[PDB]
Design a protein around this ligand. Structure first.
Ligand SMILES: *[C@@H]1O[C@H](CO)[C@@H](O)[C@H](O)[C@H]1NC(C)=O
Lengths: 52, 53, 269, 49
């Protein structure tokens, strides 16, 4: 929130209020739980098998 | 009766895919499997030494 | 660019194979990304040359600290995110008589294989008004009252130690050739070798067919040039350029290759 | 079902290894030259080639 560049958290808005949360809780799935590799701002990279 | 593992020591083996693509010299690295059972149960030989304190 | 290391003259017979020896353990990489961002810090305590240092606590990049002594649990504390800001300082919650001595904070980069260490001298007093931190000329010396915590500062703000980048593959080795009469900067490239394995040779087939480097070049950091079937047109100033741009290794070696003679060479360098 | 018994490979450092003729069923041995194996902390062998 205070415009640092820390490597622990993330921002998410609710009712035009910017709240904070943890990188370790986010996840992406196609069918299997994917693996997060590259994490930068509004961008995420993943490498995970054939899901529909 | 399980007092056979006295002077043992675990490994660091050459895991081909440690996740995220590449290889790792990893301790969880599996070396050999055997699937002789007729009902899908799997007997696995991993580079850890579990149960031992 | 780079800096010079060895600027030698090599005399060999025509028709033989030239070997321009170029070796470096700090340019090693493999066809894997196997802990290629692995660093380790560790705190050791010693008491001079005639005492044995003991490992107290060590730490891998992006992890949580592991303590070696059960007494030292909840007593020696490091910042678990030391590799984000380069603040590797160690807090001792409560000191005793076994803790007096010189502490070394050791930074090690396993990928570039560089090692660096710093010392701090601990003296434990009884009066708190004598407690100070001063510079003895080459290391910080802290005098701390017994039972008080001790913050032994270890701060290294170099970019190579933090978790910011470490995109490894930008090491590159260049093989250059300077023909006689040809001025510098317009030298023809002989080989470009990327850590991933890709090679670029330049020139007509007569040069490309005869220029090779051993297939384990980047794996062992030996980029020695092998020139098969030496011709008179091969003479000149050859240069091996080893570049590990992220960890700041930038070296070149220069070989003055003259082909005249098989046996009566003088040993240079 | 068979079981492929594969022991640890004999890395002959700074030397040339020699195959010993055993009477095992489907006994297989092969000596590969110019190997330079790497471990966690670098080369297992002191010699280069
Ligand atoms: C480094 O860590 C110590 C330990 O508490 C802390 O007091 C200090 O403020 C830190 N400095 C920086 C620049 O993070």
């Amino acid at each position: 929130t205070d415009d640092s560049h820390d490597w622990t958290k993330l921002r998410y808005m609710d009712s035009h209020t910017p709240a904070d949360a943890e990188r370790a809780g986010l996840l992406v799935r196609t069918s299997a739980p994917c693996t997060i590799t590259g994490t930068m701002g509004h961008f995420i990279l993943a490498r995970c098998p054939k899901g529909e | 009766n399980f007092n056979v593992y006295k002077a043992t020591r675990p490994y660091l083996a050459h895991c081909p895919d440690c996740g995220e693509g590449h290889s790792c010299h990893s301790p969880i690295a599996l070396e050999r499997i055997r699937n002789e059972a007729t009902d899908g149960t799997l007997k696995i030989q991993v580079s850890l030494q579990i149960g031992i304190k | 660019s780079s800096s010079l290391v060895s600027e030698s003259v090599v005399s060999l017979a025509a028709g033989t194979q030239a070997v321009l020896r170029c070796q470096s353990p700090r340019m090693v990489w493999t066809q894997d990304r196997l802990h290629d961002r692995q660093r380790v810090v560790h705190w050791d305590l010693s008491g001079g040359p005639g005492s044995q240092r003991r490992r107290l606590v060590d730490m891998y990049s992006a992890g949580e600290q592991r303590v070696y002594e059960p007494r030292d649990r909840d007593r020696l504390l490091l910042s678990p995110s030391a590799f984000h800001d380069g603040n590797f300082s160690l807090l001792i919650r409560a000191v005793d008589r076994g803790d007096e001595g010189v502490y070394t904070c050791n930074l090690h980069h396993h990928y570039c294989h560089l090692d660096e260490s710093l010392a701090v001298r601990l003296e434990v007093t009884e009066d708190p008004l004598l407690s100070r931190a001063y510079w003895d000329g080459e290391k910080e010396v802290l005098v701390v009252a017994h039972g008080a915590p001790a913050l032994m500062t270890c701060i290294n703000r170099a970019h190579v130690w933090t978790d910011r980048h470490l995109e490894e593959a930008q090491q590159v080795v260049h093989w250059d050739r300077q023909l006689p009469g040809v001025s510098h900067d317009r030298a023809d490239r002989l080989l470009d070798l990327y850590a991933s394995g890709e090679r670029r040779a330049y020139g007509p087939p007569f040069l490309r067919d005869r220029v090779s480097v051993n297939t384990n070049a980047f794996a062992r950091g030996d980029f020695s040039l092998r020139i098969d079937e030496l011709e008179r047109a091969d003479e000149g100033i050859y240069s091996c350029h080893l570049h590990h741009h992220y960890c700041g290794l930038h070296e070149r070696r220069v070989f003055h290759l003259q082909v005249t003679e098989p046996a009566f060479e003088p040993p240079s360098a | 079902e068979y079981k492929t018994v594969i022991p640890s490979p004999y890395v002959k450092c700074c030397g040339t290894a020699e195959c010993k003729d055993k009477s095992l069923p489907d006994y297989s041995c092969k000596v590969f030259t110019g190997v330079y194996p790497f471990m966690w902390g670098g080369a297992y062998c002191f010699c280069d080639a």
